[PDB]
Symmetry: C2
Subunit: 441 residues, 2 copies
């Protein structure tokens, strides 16, 4: 149970709305002391920013591990020669940040890792009985985005969990796809989000193994066309069996129309969605699952021996979650006039203690008591022990979006009561200060 | 309890001592399926290697936090404008990896973060009442080492925990320095190491505020002179009070002679250290604590308003732990002829189950029983369920360094017994199946 006293913390709250911020999420992240811009599209994560980033990572890691994925780490710097093997060194484009070392060797900050994971695989895996296999990392990306914008939403240095699956053939690769589908539905649900999987841009051989997970939002870049029925589908629980038939689940999700603007078909839209359920809106892309087949295993020669002594290129898929983008996305969906409203699973703290008369021996002594008690019980607690006046303590607390507040002061406390305020709806309640620890654990 | 079955893992064991490896720790990291080179000094962390790196990381973090330091995350790329402020852009030398983006703007992959952290601080901290403040992060660094060597021990892309303290004056900085001294003693102790605080090279302006923490090894790059009594000093428990006087803790560690080749004075060593106690050997620097006073605050005009009423530049110190170097150091100190011997705090798994007849209906059943039950009770458990023969399962288990092994074969289970083997000393015990969990739990 992680714990902090605000006076022992670094949380530089901003009084005014920063003029460089064009949207809510960006604006609130700067003002809640979560983020500092160091270059265009390149940010430092200040303490509170960091805590939520780490909460999000964990959830992503857990749902990857539940689905069978195995975690590694690839370096951020990759050699160009590896990318020359695939064709992509020159076909990728200006988004690639190329680097020369002291010896003039050609490097590049990885924008993605298809070549490097196929290179690691082909070194060690030679048989079909190793497969399916899915390896992932959570690692910093660099895309030299032409016009960085919207804070974490479109940065240059960003965090992606990217996972890549290896299979004998398409049929199997499809099984690997379906695992990730379900893992992603659960990943986003756990963050308080309805990230709807939409049919997305496929490659040249087309087919149907490309989806984008899109959080609905007027201020998003993706144009989207859905049947509203999609927004009410049930999400698999933690006990979903990842070795079984996942088809009946996927079919639930893929049976209602949901296409991005890239693959939308207006004829097919009408003749499938009732005008009643048609929503043409937009959203924020928080992940993407994509089957690529033998695109890298062909040119880089990643083969295995099949179940008939025969050598063939493996079939691949890639799966990406925008981990840092997600802080932006979550704030868009979870805010009000007074600031952030974190889902509990991602909040940097679960509870903040507001001393409403700092120094005063009765309130200080009660706030110390409540602090170490909740602290010792496993609860993530922030104790606002600063010199600030009450109204400032309230405003800061509402702003940084901590799920629950405990209001402690001379009025209620020198009478044996504290106040518990839920951030989500503003629900107030009075409790004896002995009973409140129990309420939260 | 982060549990895994070896049939569903990625652990590419290597039969033959790789030719590229010059020292034990690099050889075993490769053999044990922990590491894979992608360029000189740049490595992918394979699943078992990554798990160790994360354990080390968490220990480092927990100990920084206990001492009161506050975690953020600075980006890997920094502006050259930033380093021109300090003068260090052109002074740092050819280890700095310079990068030009698409708009011709000048960046670098940061080799250290003193300018960046002084820039964050100066944007926000204006008064001495915000001090002392320690901000730190665990981030990937690049240093274009002249000769990358010794695997992870001298990489180019490497992980460091770097902390940076801010204080009003020199007196206050020494206090910040002492907390990190104590935190480093605790950090390295928890890793099963004797990293010794040696007096190290000081800045141009002299003094007694530089210490390298060095784990002795015949083979290391650092030349060290010690009083052997230093190896037996006590390491403060976790209830050490950081807000109080740490001097008597520091004075116990500084009173025995210990110095690196660069500050060693033979005359003073002859005088202070009894002939029998004298020891001149090598070791691996795993950490450094360092005071730089006003070095960055001066050039970058990062002042606070003091208690006397007036403006003055802050005093700083930097404290670095080689997180990734630490896997090489631990293996050097903790191995035998059979492979790695992980201290259990940094070990990738706590117990490995070895099934000695794979497919035997009876022993499969007992292994699963054991696997699932050790999961549920908290234990990092590997179940080697592979189609290997016993002699191979012992060899891999020994090699990868897992602290405990449970040997399970048809013989012992007919008597309702199993073996528990300790990797470190080869201790073994024969006991009831129904009893093995309780010892481990
Ligand atoms: N510049 C960026 N900043 C932050 N997150 C990003 C960025 N680029 C991609 N992401 C995240 O990475 C995920 C997977 O990466 P992918 O390469 O599929 O993105 P993309 O299709 O190039 O994104 P976009 O179309 O937004 O530029 C995306 O779904 C998104 O959540
Ligand atoms: N090239 C490297 N590879 C791995 N770890 C390193 C490397 N350089 C530094 N470190 C780690 O970071 C810590 C602090 O960094 P610092 O800049 O003080 O190292 P340094 O003086 O450059 O040491 P070295 O003499 O090893 O180059 C070091 O104690 C070491 O453990
Ligand atoms: Mg893009
Ligand atoms: Mg896209
Ligand atoms: Mg995409
Ligand atoms: Mg060096
Ligand atoms: Mg050094
Ligand atoms: Mg050093």
């Amino acid at each position: 149970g992680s714990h902090m006293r605000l006076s022992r913390f670094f949380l530089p709250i901003l009084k005014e709305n920063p003029k460089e911020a064009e949207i809510v999420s960006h604006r609130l992240m700067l003002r809640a002391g979560m983020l500092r811009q160091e270059a265009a599209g390149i940010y430092a994560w200040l303490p509170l920013g960091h805590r939520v980033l780490k909460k999000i990572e964990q959830i992503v890691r857990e749902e990857q591990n539940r689905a069978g994925a195995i975690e590694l780490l690839m370096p951020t710097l990759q050699l160009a020669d590896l990318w020359r093997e695939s064709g992509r060194y020159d076909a990728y484009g200006p988004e690639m940040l190329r680097i020369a070392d002291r010896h003039k060797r050609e490097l590049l900050y990885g924008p993605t890792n298809e070549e490097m994971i196929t290179e690691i695989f082909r070194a060690y895996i030679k048989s079909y009985k190793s497969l399916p296999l899915n390896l992932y990392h959570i690692q910093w990306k660099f895309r030299d985005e032409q016009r960085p914008r919207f804070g974490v939403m479109r940065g240059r240095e960003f965090l992606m969990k990217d996972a890549y699956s290896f299979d004998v053939d398409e049929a199997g690769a499809r099984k690997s796809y379906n695992k990730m589908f379900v893992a992603y539905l659960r990943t986003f649900a756990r963050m308080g989000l309805k990230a709807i999987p939409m049919r997305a841009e496929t490659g040249p051989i087309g087919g149907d193994l490309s989806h984008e997970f899109i959080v609905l939002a007027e201020t998003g870049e993706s144009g989207v066309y859905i049947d509203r029925d999609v927004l009410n589908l049930p999400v698999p629980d933690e006990n979903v069996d990842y070795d079984g038939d996942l088809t009946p689940i996927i079919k639930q999700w893929t049976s209602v129309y949901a296409a991005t603007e890239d693959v939308h078909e207006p004829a097919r839209y009408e003749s499938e969605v009732p005008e009643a359920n048609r929503l043409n809106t937009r959203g924020i892309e928080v992940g993407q699952i994509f089957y690529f087949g033998t695109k890298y295993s062909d040119s880089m020669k990643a083969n295995v021996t099949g179940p008939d002594g025969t050598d063939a290129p493996i079939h691949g898929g890639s799966y990406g979650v925008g981990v840092s983008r997600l802080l932006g996305a979550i704030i868009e969906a979870c805010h009000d006039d007074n600031g952030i409203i974190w889902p509990e699973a991602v909040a940097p703290f679960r509870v903040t203690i507001l001393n409403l008369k700092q120094g005063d021996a009765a309130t200080d002594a009660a706030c110390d008591q409540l602090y170490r008690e909740l602290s010792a019980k496993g609860v993530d607690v922030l104790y606002d022990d600063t010199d600030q006046r009450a109204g400032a303590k309230f405003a800061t607390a509402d702003l940084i979006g901590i799920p629950w507040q405990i209001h402690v002061g001379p009025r209620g406390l020198a009478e044996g009561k504290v106040e518990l305020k839920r951030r989500s709806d503003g629900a107030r309640e009075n409790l004896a200060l002995a009973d409140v620890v129990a309420r939260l654990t």
